[PDB]
Amino acid sequence: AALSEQLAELEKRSGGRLGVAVLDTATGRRFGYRGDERFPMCSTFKALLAAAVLARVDQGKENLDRRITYGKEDLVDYSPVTEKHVGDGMTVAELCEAAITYSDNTAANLLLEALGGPAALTAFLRSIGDNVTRLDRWEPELNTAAPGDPRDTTTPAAMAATLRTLLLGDVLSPASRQQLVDWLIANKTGDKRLRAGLPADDRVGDKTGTGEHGTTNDIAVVWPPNHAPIFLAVYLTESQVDADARDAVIAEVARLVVAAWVHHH
Amino acid sequence: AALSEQLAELEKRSGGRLGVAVLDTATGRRFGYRGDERFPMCSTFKALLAAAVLARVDQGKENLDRRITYGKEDLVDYSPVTEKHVGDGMTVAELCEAAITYSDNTAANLLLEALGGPAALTAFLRSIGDNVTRLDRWEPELNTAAPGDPRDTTTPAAMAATLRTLLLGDVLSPASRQQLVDWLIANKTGDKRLRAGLPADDRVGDKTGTGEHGTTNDIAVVWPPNHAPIFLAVYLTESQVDADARDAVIAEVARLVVAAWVHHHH
Amino acid sequence: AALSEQLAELEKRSGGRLGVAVLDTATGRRFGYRGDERFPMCSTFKALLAAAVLARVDQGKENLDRRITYGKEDLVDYSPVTEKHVGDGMTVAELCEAAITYSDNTAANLLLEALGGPAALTAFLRSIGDNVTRLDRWEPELNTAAPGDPRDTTTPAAMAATLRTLLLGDVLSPASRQQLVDWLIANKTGDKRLRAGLPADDRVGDKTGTGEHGTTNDIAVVWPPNHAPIFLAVYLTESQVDADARDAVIAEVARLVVAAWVHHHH
Ligand code: NA
């Protein structure tokens, strides 16, 4: 396969370990490069976090309008949205929007205790047939991305399959599926990653992840024109190139994937 | 409200952080002073622990007559009932009664074991719509009550609303609801707190909490004569006065809330 | 009871603490020697781990054919099967077979991950009415078997009753019940323990456990000829004799139990 050889070369240039999974729901075709290896998910877990909250909203156990207040001691790093509402708090819906579109870390911590902690998120994932993904820690510790540590990891194939189930399955109500899609489409953190390499007329929703040990992740749902959605999970870790080059690797994966798919047609 | 100002002055005299929530089920009237701030709940969680046990009994995954045995090495501090039954053990019902009416710490640990741990209690609370309260540790570490630590915390408003759903809603069976009510009414540890400030003809059940960093708590269900229950959750932490004065702060909160309620009518 | 006196003297020969539980499903008779006390499970938990995985297969949330891959660095000690499939991985069914019949430790960790962790296994046991057994750690730490540590423990009576409900109750589908039975019957690690002392015409399935502090365990389901199943949970810890002599204690428990049952019938 030419795409696998292309990704192996791109992986070698990055100096780290690269994981790619593609799921085309029009064809059923799947592609994987290290698709069944574990990678630190980092903030890419926040897409699953909002899904578990929306499921509880569907169950009548949670309300998007419920207001959550907090103090300045509850703020952790990379919280550009929650740092502004120490005085008035934020609603659950506003916290999910901040956690997805701005990768707000404190918002994720507040939503995690709304669920009951990382084990509750893992249990929700087990409840929908994801027997692979696991969340173990809170922010910011879940971003350590140490080699050999299975904590807070997923595989590209499992993540892509889980999002297909979340966005297109019967797990969430039609209202919450659309809300999760709307949040991912409105992401502001991934202009340099998968979105950069995708054709401009593609409708894209995505959630990014960044961690230590040169970790750069991006997960997307892609709607080509008059085309069923394509799910894409890219994970890069242990890489030796700088932050901008790691983003370009993700963008390069997008270009390689699209160019592999123009051959299938 | 004059009550908010009165509690502000009482909070000032306490030197700490005071949290108050009132839930009046006869009218629907609610009141809160820092009702949405997190407080170390300490032993007040044992009311929710017993409810989670009773829910599993209603579930017939648990039996109130089931006997649990333990050794002296399993005893933690302040366990006045469980320390007397190292030889013969205690039933689940006896452990719940000991955990509520005497705030027995080892009894709480054994019941947490019967649940499957603090995360199992949190999961039960999430199953009944409490998205705020969390238990994270066992006895006695859950009582460290460090400022800024969200572990083992609740808010006054959440605890009052959860106590209401457990005692009035249909989370528990009628028999289980009456049993939890009976345990709370039979409490022996809270005579100097909310009970002290309430009118004598009030039917009251309560659960106390005490911890480090000058922490003194009390949650209660109060039935005035010919009156639907009123749920009351009071949390004091970081206070700078001794334990006797902290109990007096809780008793004064009951006096102020009652005085505010009678002024609401006459 | 003579069997109680006999187990008492045998316990003292072992130099440690001995726990025995018998559950005869033909008559309902149950026997216990320290059947209420907690013992470190060690690998005996893997029988419950496979049941929890089989329950999810019944629910359609897991597939026995699902392949799991792992790396060289993921292997822990005592992993005779998993160490040969770093390249090709293994299916869930293959991991359950290795975890049960060879007591493979890495296979158990991979299956614990498929569940969501030790707390997920404990939650499954609470869901079927086992309010006693708890798993807290992963391999190999769960085999520490420190005296007084309630982590990763069960009681003989709870394990026998749980094994009974898993193999004969409505928890699992008949297909997964038969699969769990077939795995236990195919165990390769218990020839020197309970199986050694049982009559040769008995059909036996078992799961062994071994840990530090001289811990030697074995749980079994025993089919005598034309007789309903008998469940037997034997736990030994803090033993002062070597590994072979600890194995011989378990075999002697089987001999003592069978002889006592011979007296029950005649
Ligand atoms: Na004892």
Author numbering:
A (entry chain C): 27 to 58, 60 to 238, 240 to 252, 254 to 294
B (entry chain A), C (entry chain B): 27 to 58, 60 to 238, 240 to 252, 254 to 295
What does the paper say about this structure?
The starting point of the engineering efforts reported here is a Kemp eliminase we previously obtained through minimalist design on a β-lactamase background. Our design took advantage of the conformational flexibility of an ancestral β-lactamase scaffold to produce both a suitable cavity and a catalytic base within it through a single mutation, while a second mutation enhanced relevant interactions at the de novo active site. Kemp elimination is a straightforward proton–abstraction reaction that can be performed by a simple molecular machinery consisting, at the bare minimum, of a catalytic base. FuncLib does not per se predict mutations that enhance catalysis, but rather suggests variants with multiple mutations that generate stabilizing interacting networks at the active site, thus focusing the search to safe regions of the sequence space.
Finally, we have used X-ray crystallography to determine the 3D-structures of the catalytically optimized GNCA4-2, GNCA4-12 and GNCA4-19 variants, the first of which has a transition state analogue bound at the de novo active site. These particular structures were chosen as they are all highly active variants, in terms of the measured rates within the available substrate concentration range, with improved catalytic parameters over GNCA4-WT. The protein backbones of these new structures are essentially superimposable with that of the background GNCA4-WT variant and, therefore, the observed enhancement of catalysis is likely linked to small rearrangements in the de novo active site. Here, our crystal structures illustrate that significant gains in activity can be achieved without the need for corresponding significant active site rearrangement. The short extrapolation leads to a catalytic efficiency and a turnover number of about 2 × 104 M–1 s–1 and 102 s–1. These values are well within the ranges of catalytic parameters for modern natural enzymes and, in particular, the value 102 s–1 for kcat is about one order of magnitude higher than the median value of the kcat distribution for modern enzymes. To assess this, we also performed EVB simulations on the variants for which crystal structures were available: GNCA-2, GNCA-12 and GNCA-19. For these variants, the calculated values fall to within 1.3 kcal mol–1 of the experimental values, and can deviate by up to 2.2 kcal mol–1 from the values calculated from the FuncLib predicted structures.
